């Protein structure tokens, strides 16, 4: 499934804005890390795929996401990067943890209103709905007691027919 770019930014930007609202916890995450300016060339050595809030914002605004799991993935990439580089004891690690707690409370309802099981990051074990092409966690939607001989169908598509 490809959503309209405007549909995704209306739905998802409130979750990004919740992170920007966190003062001071979000300040280290607003721009891409410049290792020259901060004096840490070893950033490049530890972090292979940099990400930050400004980049995520530009992507929503220019429509560079086709579906919301891509957005979730970028958010977690940013968190995992800061957790990887910074020591558990550092203020930035604790700040990152704070943003992830905030994101997890915001994201579930928002992803649900977009017709998804949840907003959590779990496996790469997904199932595509055979009607609308949304991807759900296998662990969220599949059950021993239910067989779909013609492929999985999410609850939204089931109510429609």
């Amino acid at each position: 499934k490809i959503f309209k770019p405007e549909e995704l930014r209306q739905a998802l930007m409130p979750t990004l804005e919740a992170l920007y609202r966190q003062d001071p916890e979000s300040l280290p995450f607003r721009q891409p890390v410049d290792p020259q300016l901060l004096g840490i060339p070893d950033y490049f050595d530890i972090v292979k795929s940099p990400m930050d809030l400004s980049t995520i914002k530009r992507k929503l605004d220019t429509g560079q996401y086709q579906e919301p799991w891509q957005y979730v993935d970028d958010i977690w990439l940013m968190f995992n990067n800061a957790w990887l580089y910074n020591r558990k004891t550092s203020r930035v690690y604790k700040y990152c943890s704070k943003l992830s707690e905030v994101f997890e409370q915001e994201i579930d309802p928002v992803m649900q209103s977009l017709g998804y099981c949840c907003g959590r990051k779990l496996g790469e074990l997904f199932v595509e709905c055979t009607e609308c092409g949304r991807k759900m966690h296998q662990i969220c939607v599949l059950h021993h007691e239910i067989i779909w001989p013609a492929g999985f169908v999410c609850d939204g598509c089931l109510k429609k027919s």
Binding site: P24, S26, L27, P28, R30, N86, R91, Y95
Partner: peptide, 9 residues
């Protein structure tokens, strides 16, 4: 912020 050595808090 920018709370990563080089900078402060």
């Amino acid at each position: 912020g920018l709370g990563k050595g080089g900078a402060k808090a």
